Amino acid sequence: APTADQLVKGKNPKLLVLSQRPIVLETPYDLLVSQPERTPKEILYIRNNVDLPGYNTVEGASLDGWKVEVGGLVDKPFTFEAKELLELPQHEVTMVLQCSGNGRSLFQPRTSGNPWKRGGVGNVTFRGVRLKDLLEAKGVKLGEKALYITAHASRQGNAPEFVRSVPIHALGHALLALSMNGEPLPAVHGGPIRLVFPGYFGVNNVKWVQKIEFTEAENTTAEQMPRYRVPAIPNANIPFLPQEPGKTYPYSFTNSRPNWLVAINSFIFAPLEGQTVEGPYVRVEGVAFNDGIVPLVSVEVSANGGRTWQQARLERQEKSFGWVRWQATLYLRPGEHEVMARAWDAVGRSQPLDGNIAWNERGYEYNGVMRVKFTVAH
Amino acid sequence: APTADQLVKGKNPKLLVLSQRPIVLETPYDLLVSQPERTPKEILYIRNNVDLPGYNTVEGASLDGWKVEVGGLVDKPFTFEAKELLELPQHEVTMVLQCSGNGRSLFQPRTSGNPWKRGGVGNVTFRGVRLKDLLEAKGVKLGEKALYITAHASRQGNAPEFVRSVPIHALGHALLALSMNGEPLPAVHGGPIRLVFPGYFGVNNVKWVQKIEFTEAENTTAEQMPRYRVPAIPNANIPFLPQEPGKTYPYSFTNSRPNWLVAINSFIFAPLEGQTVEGPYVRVEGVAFNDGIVPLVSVEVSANGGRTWQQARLERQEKSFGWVRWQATLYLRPGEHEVMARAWDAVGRSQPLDGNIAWNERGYEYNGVMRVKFTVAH
Numbered sequence: 036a037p038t039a040d041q042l043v044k045g046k047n048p049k050l051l052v053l054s055q056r057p058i059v060l061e062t063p064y065d066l067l068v069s070q071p072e073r074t075p076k077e078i079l080y081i082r083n084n085v086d087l088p089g090y091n092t093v094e095g096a097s098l099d100g101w102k103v104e105v106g107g108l109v110d111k112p113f114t115f116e117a118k119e120l121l122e123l124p125q126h127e128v129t130m131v132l133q134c135s136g137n138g139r140s141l142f143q144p145r146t147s148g149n150p151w152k153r154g155g156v157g158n159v160t161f162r163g164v165r166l167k168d169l170l171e172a173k174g175v176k177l178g179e180k181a182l183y184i185t186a187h188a189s190r191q192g193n194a195p196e197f198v199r200s201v202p203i204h205a206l207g208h209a210l211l212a213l214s215m216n217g218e219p220l221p222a223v224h225g226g227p228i229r230l231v232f233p234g235y236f237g238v239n240n241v242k243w244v245q246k247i248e249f250t251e252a253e254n255t256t257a258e259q260m261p262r263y264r265v266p267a268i269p270n271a272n273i274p275f276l277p278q279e280p281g282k283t284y285p286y287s288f289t290n291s292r293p294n295w296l297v298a299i300n301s302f303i304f305a306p307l308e309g310q311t312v313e314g315p316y317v318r319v320e321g322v323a324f325n326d327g328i329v330p331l332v333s334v335e336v337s338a339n340g341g342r343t344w345q346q347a348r349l350e351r352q353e354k355s356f357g358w359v360r361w362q363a364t365l366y367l368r369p370g371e372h373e374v375m376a377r378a379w380d381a382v383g384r385s386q387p388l389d390g391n392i393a394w395n396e397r398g399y400e401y402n403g404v405m406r407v408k409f410t411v412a413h
Numbered sequence: 414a415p416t417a418d419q420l421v422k423g424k425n426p427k428l429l430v431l432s433q434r435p436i437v438l439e440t441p442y443d444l445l446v447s448q449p450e451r452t453p454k455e456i457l458y459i460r461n462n463v464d465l466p467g468y469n470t471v472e473g474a475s476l477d478g479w480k481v482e483v484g485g486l487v488d489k490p491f492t493f494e495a496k497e498l499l500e501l502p503q504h505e506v507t508m509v510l511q512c513s514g515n516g517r518s519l520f521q522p523r524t525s526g527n528p529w530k531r532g533g534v535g536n537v538t539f540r541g542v543r544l545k546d547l548l549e550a551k552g553v554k555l556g557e558k559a560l561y562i563t564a565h566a567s568r569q570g571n572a573p574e575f576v577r578s579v580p581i582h583a584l585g586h587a588l589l590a591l592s593m594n595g596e597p598l599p600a601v602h603g604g605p606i607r608l609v610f611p612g613y614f615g616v617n618n619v620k621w622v623q624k625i626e627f628t629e630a631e632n633t634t635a636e637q638m639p640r641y642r643v644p645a646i647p648n649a650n651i652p653f654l655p656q657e658p659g660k661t662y663p664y665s666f667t668n669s670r671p672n673w674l675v676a677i678n679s680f681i682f683a684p685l686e687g688q689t690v691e692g693p694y695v696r697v698e699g700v701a702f703n704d705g706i707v708p709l710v711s712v713e714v715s716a717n718g719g720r721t722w723q724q725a726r727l728e729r730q731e732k733s734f735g736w737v738r739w740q741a742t743l744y745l746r747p748g749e750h751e752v753m754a755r756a757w758d759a760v761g762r763s764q765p766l767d768g769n770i771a772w773n774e775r776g777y778e779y780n781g782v783m784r785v786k787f788t789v790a791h
């Protein structure tokens with residue numbers, strides 16, 4: 036019966052243990068909602084596909100000796116020591132770090148993989164050096180065929196490979212993170228250095244980064260294809276191509292797309308499922324987010340199954356990779372009620388009313404409208 | 414001052430003349446709304462990029478002698494005469510036929526191209542033989558590398574080429590149309606044979622089809638790249654990548670996507686702009702559509718600038734390539750009012766509140782929330 040504190044030094048003992056090898060921990064929802072500004076390292080979810088031996092602590096790690104290779108389609112490949120980043124211009128970013136498998140357990144029938152509820156997400160601040168700023172300092176130029184950034188994790192400890200490719204558009208905000216929430220990046224969260232892509236699913240934010248290559252194509256590792264993909268019509272304007280629930284799909288590069296941009300979403304933080312609340316005026320609160328490319332336009336709530344939707348008040352109006360808090364105050368008579376929340380962004384993206392339309396066999400990118408049932412009292 | 418009836422035999426004289434060579438005609442909105450079930454050939458918009466000499470009539474054309482080549486990545490290329498289709502299984506489809514430039518004039522600043530309002534759309538029924546059913550009858554199998562259908566218009570009359578590529582997924586519903594709205598396909602609408610792709614923008618539905626090739630890549634004609642594209646992150650889940658309005662974009666195959674799937678939309682048919690209507694109860698009516706891959710979930714209307722949204726009643730609930738009629742009845746006090754409509758489909762797609770976020774220099778795929786201002790009387 037090993038608890039989270041025993042698997043990972045400094046983790047809150049209440050974290051749900053989804054897997055021991057590799058280490059997978061989920062934040063209980065009540066704990067997640069207690070930190071609506073920023074998710075602390077004590078409770079932040081963990082998902083290792085590949086464990087790095089000795090990295091199972093929230094303590095920072097040493098930069099000493101850590102070398103990163105940069106190459107591929109650049110005019111002048113080079114190697115740098117992580118410590119050299121301390122002298123370069125630094126940037127900070129608050130972003131939603133969300134597992135592509137977050138919400139997996141809401142798909143029916145059951146899919147393959149760690150059975151997340153909604154606790155495979157956090158809102159965190161990374162600080163470090165932008166990849167573009169490093170290239171600039173080193174006097175390096177990208178080739179015309181550089182269409183992807185392909186990042187490889189350390190193989191120290193005889194670890195298996197972990198290699199992800201994201202579109203070259205990600206170079207705009209790509210960050211070599213040395214710090215998280217103002218402290219040394221925790222070892223277990225990729226310290227001493229992690230390549231982060233704001234507004235991309237967690238899988239892409241490569242912990243313990245050792246090599247960065249600019250490539251003309253997606254890498255052909257198993258972690259790029261067939262895993263961490265959903266059925267799609269490539270380069271057509273549909274979020275995914277729906278499939279029969281429960282059926283195996285023959286994933287290829289040409290019939291599916293990677294888990295890249297964080298799917299637009301909204302979580303209801305109050306009230307909680309099954310809670311009793313009082314009076315007629317019921318303040319519904321939560322957070323909402325997208326991939327940070329454009330602002331949210333609205334978060335809307337309905338207590339009548341979608342017959343009418345009421346605009347919530349959002350605490351910030353600018354675009355952001357971090358979540359945005361919202362509230363909507365509703366007049367409700369005593370009794371059982373159900374509230375749902377829906378986000379809507381400036382380019383028209385929103386959430387499916389029934390998230391199960393997105394059923395896929397490894398259970399990625401769930402973003403169905405969240406519903407909460409509770410009781411209103413006198 | 415040549416009117417539409419003089420440019421194209423059998424067209425309603427009230428059609429707006431956007432261009433004489435090539436021929437471009439737009440349906441006035443009042444006429445469009447008068448036909449909420451099916452748009453007749455007398456009023457249906459015309460957009461030729463490339464005129465076919467002598468095809469400027471709503472009359473049907475002869476199938477005699479019309480040969481179509483089918484080849485590329487198929488095991489057994491072949492040629493067929495259009496008349497052979499008369500003996501094969503036939504299918505009909507009602508679909509929104511919409512110019513990718515429809516709505517172009519709502520972009521600010523002005524973009525390049527024919528200045529459509531909203532009359533570059535119709536709802537029509539095509540009948541003919543499915544491309545897949547033809548391949549089956551001929552005992553032909555697609556190669557494993559067939560990722561696109563590339564269709565070429567007739568060059569008769571020494572006409573310039575017109576070549577479009579759509580994803581092989583389109584093979585599911587691709588139709589060799591011989592009839593429109595129950596009559597011989599009008600010459601000016603591509604008679605005697607047009608390759609139609611339900612739920613794809615009009616540009617893709619190749620009139621006077623003479624060659625169909627299954628190809629591994631998009632064709633490299635000017636009509637495929639750089640035209641009929643919008644900025645994008647290829648194979649990422651965002652409908653388009655927003656750009657600064659008024660700025661020229663360096664279109665390539667790797668930074669933009671074609672005008673393929675019809676963008677989700679909703680049009681308000683009643684009331685009309687500037688109209689006075691009576692009593693407190695105001696019935697708002699219109700149509701809505703997507704690319705037909707999934708059903709619409711709702712059409713919603715707001716008369717308070719989006720503070721509250723009310724679900725309309727849709728006349729049909731199943732998915733469709735054709736538009737779906739809706740109505741929402743609102744209680745409104747006397748005075749000036751503004752109503753807006755928003756569609757929402759099962760995969761979460763919706764419309765941008767401000768359609769100008771999609772500004773692109775050739776003015777494609779406008780689908781901003783439609784607003785109508787009118788007066789309520791006592």
Ligand code: MSS
Pocket residue numbers: 079080081082083084085086132133134135136188189197223224225236237238239240241242243294
């Ligand atoms: N190196 C590395 N990195 C990496 C990995 C591994 O395994 N390795 N994983 C992923 C995932 S998958 Mo699904 O999309 S989520 C996720 C993330 C997590 O984070 P944290 O653990 O820190 O929270 O990470 C990311 N990155």
Ligand code: MSS
Pocket residue numbers: 457458459460461462463464510511512513514566567575601602603614615616617618619620621672
């Ligand atoms: N062959 C051909 N086809 C074709 C063409 C040309 O020019 N040619 N155009 C386009 C377009 S461009 Mo924009 O996306 S719209 C459109 C359409 C139209 O139809 P109608 O004329 O029938 O209505 O067609 C289509 N197809």
Ligand SMILES: [Cl-]
Pocket residue numbers: 082134136148149
């Ligand atoms: Cl997982």
Ligand SMILES: [Cl-]
Pocket residue numbers: 460512514526527
């Ligand atoms: Cl046009």
